[PDB]
Amino acid sequence: NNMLNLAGTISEAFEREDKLVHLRLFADTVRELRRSDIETLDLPKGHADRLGKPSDHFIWDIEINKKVKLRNWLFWIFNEFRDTYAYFDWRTFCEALGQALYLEAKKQVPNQFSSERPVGATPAMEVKTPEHDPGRAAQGPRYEWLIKGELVSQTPFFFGWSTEATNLKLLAARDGRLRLPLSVLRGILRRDIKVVLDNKCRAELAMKQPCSCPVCNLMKKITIRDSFSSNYAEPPKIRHKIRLDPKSGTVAKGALFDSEVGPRGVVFPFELRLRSADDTLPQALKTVFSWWQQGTVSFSGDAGTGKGIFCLRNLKSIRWDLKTEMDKYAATLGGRKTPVGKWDKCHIPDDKTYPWVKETVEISVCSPFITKDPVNSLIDSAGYDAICYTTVDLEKKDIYLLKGESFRGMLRTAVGRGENLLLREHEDCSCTLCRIFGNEHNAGKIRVEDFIIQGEPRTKLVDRVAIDRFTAGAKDKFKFDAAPIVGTPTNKLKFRGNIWIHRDLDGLACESLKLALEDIENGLYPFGGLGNAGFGWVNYNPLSHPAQEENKADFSLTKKMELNWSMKELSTDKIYWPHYFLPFGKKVLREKTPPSHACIDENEDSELYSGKIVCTLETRTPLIIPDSEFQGEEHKSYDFFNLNGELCIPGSEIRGMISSVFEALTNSCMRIFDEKKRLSWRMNPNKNRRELDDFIPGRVTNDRKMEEMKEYRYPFYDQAITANDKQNKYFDQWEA
Amino acid sequence: ILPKDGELRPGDLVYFREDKKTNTVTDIIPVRISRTVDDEVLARKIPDDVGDVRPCVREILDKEKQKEIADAGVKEVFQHHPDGLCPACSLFGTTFYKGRIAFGFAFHKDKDPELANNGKHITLPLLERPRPTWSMPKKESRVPGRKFYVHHQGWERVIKHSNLDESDPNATKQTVNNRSVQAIKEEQKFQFEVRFENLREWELGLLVYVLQLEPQFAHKLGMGKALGFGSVRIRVGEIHSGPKELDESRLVSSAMKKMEEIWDRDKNVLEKLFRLLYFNESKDIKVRYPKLQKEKEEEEEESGYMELAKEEYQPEQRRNKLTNPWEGWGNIL
Amino acid sequence: SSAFSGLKIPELSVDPAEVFKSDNPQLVSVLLDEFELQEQRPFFSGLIPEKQINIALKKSPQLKKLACHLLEAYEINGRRWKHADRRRVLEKAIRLLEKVSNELKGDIQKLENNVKESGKDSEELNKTREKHGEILADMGRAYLHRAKIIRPKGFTIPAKKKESLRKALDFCKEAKARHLAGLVGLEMDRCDMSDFDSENSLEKL
RNA sequence: UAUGUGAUGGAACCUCUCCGGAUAAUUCUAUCUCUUCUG
Ligand SMILES: [Zn+2]
Ligand SMILES: [Zn+2]
Ligand SMILES: [Zn+2]
């Protein structure tokens, strides 16, 4: 109840400031704080406007119940809770505060999330007693095998934890250790053995008689121990996903999802015990072990985005005979009471039958790369407005990468644009797009891994502003910041990743995937955000063409429209104003349906063309482009903009100039305009009445509407000195 | 005057104003002479004889009915103009839409291009935020229009004033409010590319013309535009239309048709715009600011912002001689 | 038609623009946020501000009218449509009715504590309870209609039909409906299921 | 906290579907301040 009251109070403060669009962001931010630890916590600050005066953060400096600083209110609340409740820590407090705020958001802030979620489930539990005598048999076990091993996660994994009544979280033990259930391992093993033996068994829950058949005849004699994370107990990380709208190219109304994801490198011990009447291991088990040793199969839930790849190492086994070596077996009770002394090594040589195909992909980026992490940007002390996504590795430091979900989205969008299938209904469709990636009532045939940047990337500070069109200059103090990875044509960024496809995929789907990959390599789709500002361009070599000499396709608009142009003549004996104002036009032409993005070419009303333009820029007068860093404390010296010692001009400046000239020509609207502003001016001392303000005073603590009038008099207490008349007569006689 | 922290307190001493009206008080002023403030908002201060120039994406809060709509929850239906999107918002994109053109980075053939002032730092003078209450004197004034900067050769004076001995009174002081920056010499070339997709032929023609103006005119870029820095010119080398065929004649004809449809044979605004893009290379042309409060004896020019508002400009007429490009205020003494 | 005349056709939930021709903003918002926009290019238009008579600050009557219209259309012209259209219409109606029922139940839950201090005030709270009962009856109707057309995959009766019938029976019993309860019981009897006890006897229903 | 001549529940993968995307030139000139005492 205390958590609910705190969540309600926090939801009130945001509503009062008029900041209800960040409640979900804070809900994830508190869990990020959970992960970030409290001992070394240092929340960010403002943008440091003026010369050196820090400003107020837009979330961390919200007045809550007279406590202006939320950064201290949260600490005080945590201290009070720790004092009140025993067995209390930062992690539990943050988790409780997080779910509570999530509930408040879903309650008070609608339309911020999607919900056709429940489909094809219904729980079922069947049982039935036998009707006939089963009989008797004469075949029994005569051997027992104990197999050791370790499972190492070479890719982040995800095992779902859900109760009937943080929507999804990674399951773990009560002590914090990550857990790999035996049910998942048994299911994966039986699926692999069914694939090997080419069966279609479903087990039909409870039947009249046991199913028999090899799948149910071999799993009836296999015992698997549950496993726990041997070296990892830390809380996991949070990953976000969105769904775009093909027509507008932006997110949908409620497309936002969250899922905890475990780290990479967690070691899970492995245990297998097979008891059967055979002197050698079954061929299917050896085949499955061969497949597992190469890490060619997925073990976790989200296999569509390349998650849950595990590798088996250090295999060893020992065979026990219960007919003549009963004493040796009973000495160790099957290896569970006491660890076994001597182990035997197993070969398990090779196998190339697994139904997946791995193809490596390398793509080089010739521009700065940026991806936005809004939740992480609020917990980093550097204060940057946007920062790039990073992961963690338990073997070795942050690793910059592009998530495989974005690559899957890019591939799907490219295929849909190529074949014009991005708008067709996909319920009972079975088209190319519904085959490669699947629909709701199907699955996929492709697994896409993450793309890890190779090398030693470096970050840079990039600044942006919005220049009002009425009065030139910044419309507000709000500068923008980012931390992209520096990339130039000479020093490119190399991305490496793996793509797995099914052996049962038809040739047409493979050709479509190859065409999409070729288009991606050519560079029809930028990587990451800010693609329209020159960030993350593939195959960008602007210096390949040996410059632009003179000009081609030249025409004069003024001559064809009979503009006088007022050539006129300038005078030397006058001083001209540095700037002027351009009067507005009369007609503004607006349209309701701009061209769509889901189709490569659909000439419903006019032809459409796509390509690129090569340009060149030269300076008639000296140019000044400041950098983001300065050398000094009082008089800040600046250098020219550079990307690791290479001078360049950002595309934002060119965009701005071209846009502004475009509104100048076409008489469009004012795209940047501070329409919410009221002027002040001054009252002249005298001016048909110059002044008519009556004198009145505020009344007592009654209704604020009432106000009583008053008459003005004169008052003392603003003087120079008090003395006799002689001093006053001596005040004069200075001179003159 | 110590300002009150917030709101109105039951016992604060201020001055009120009352008219007949409905026996109510309309404004509150702390002292007898103070900021009169302004009713209405800047959004609807545009002239009535001009088409709607407000952004296609609007804000409902022009009244405090933003609260009634927000609580009601119908916030995505009272935004956008009833007619749709303007050509600029359509081509370049808005928050809800996405732009169809992209601008890349501009690089140099060599690693180190030439720098002005022999690589030394330039100490620019003090730059301060523009004051909007100069072209809008009275409460009944209307918005003049967009602001543009003219081209001149005033950077030579700035460079010469810097790199000067501190003993000379004409030097520029290195105060905390100043800024020191580097510059690139003239005639230095940069190369870049522009990528576009799903563009009509008239849009492509207009964009090409905007990028490649007539040789007489030039663009403006960078810091210190008022001082003459950043006059640049962009050249277009080749158009890649892909497999589809494209010829320049159709682009020119389509741009002509679109401009004729939009402007409908009106040339005053276009003439004023083209006058502002003229590249003035004369070294004898001087552009400065009036330097408020002219002092000292003798002529000392007729400039000065307060003095300029007394004789020739006047509050009624300052919505003029500012919309007329290339007009001076005072003669050389 | 004496209706909204915004939907192109009941069996395909699309709107061919023209929604903004109306004056009620709630109707436009409901028709836009819960239906396919059709067309092939994005549509960017809005209404005019400074409209009086408020906005009525709620969506429940509009959603109830949409649900009733969808059920009436399914009852009248349900034979000619194909299976996918029936499934889509029924699912959308169920979702709208569920949202309305959840909103009404939450409102009643918050109002109960306040009316506890009103000295047992018999007022519009009774009408809210009646509205909740009506919504429950409509949800039971929709669930029964959806369950009547479930595809029988496999030798045995699919579980989906069993859970749908159980939910319909629960809704009908809570809504104090007799004809719908009898229909649900008749459907349950033909499925050979015998989850009902002596208390929930078919004879008494 | 069973009741005894009869327990394959190790007899079941929370699975499946979704580009943290969109828009923005790190830019820049007009004052500020209200009570004066018959002049
Ligand atoms: Zn079987
Ligand atoms: Zn399809
Ligand atoms: Zn616009």
Author numbering:
A (entry chain B): 293 to 457, 463 to 693, 725 to 1015, 1022 to 1070
B (entry chain B): 1460 to 1792
C (entry chain A): 2 to 206
Task: Reproduce passages from the article.
In the present study, we use cryoelectron microscopy to determine structures of the Desulfonema magnum (Dm) Craspase complex to gain mechanistic insights into its regulation. We used cryoelectron microscopy (cryo-EM) to analyze the Craspase complex, which resulted in two structures, one showing clear density for crRNA and all protein domains of the complex (DmCas7-11–crRNA and DmTPR-CHATfull), whereas the second lacks density for the regions of DmTPR-CHAT (DmCas7-11–crRNA and DmTPR-CHATNTD). DmTPR-CHAT makes multi-domain interactions with DmCas7-11–crRNA via its NTD and CTD, forming two major binding sites. The overall structure of D. magnum Craspase revealed that the complex adopts a ‘closed’ conformation characterized by the steric occlusion of the first segment of the spacer crRNA by the CLD.
DmTPR-CHAT organizes into three domains: the N-terminal domain (NTD), tetratricopeptide repeat (TPR) domain and the carboxy-terminal domain (CTD). The CTD contains a caspase-like subdomain (CLS) starting from β sheet-4 at its N terminus and terminating at β sheet-11 at its C terminus. The CLS is of particular interest because predictions suggest that it acts as a trigger for cell death or dormancy via a caspase-related peptidase activity. The CLS was also similar to Cas7 (± substrate) and PIGK (phosphotidylinositol glycan anchor biosynthesis class K) with the root mean square deviation (r.m.s.d.) between the C-α atoms of the protein backbones of 1.1 and 1.4 Å. The binding site of the NTD has a larger surface area than that of the CTD. At the other site, the CTD forms salt bridges with residues from the palms of Cas7.1 and Cas7.2. In contrast, the CLD in the Craspase complex stably associates with the complex, showing that DmTPR-CHAT promotes the rigidity of the CLD.
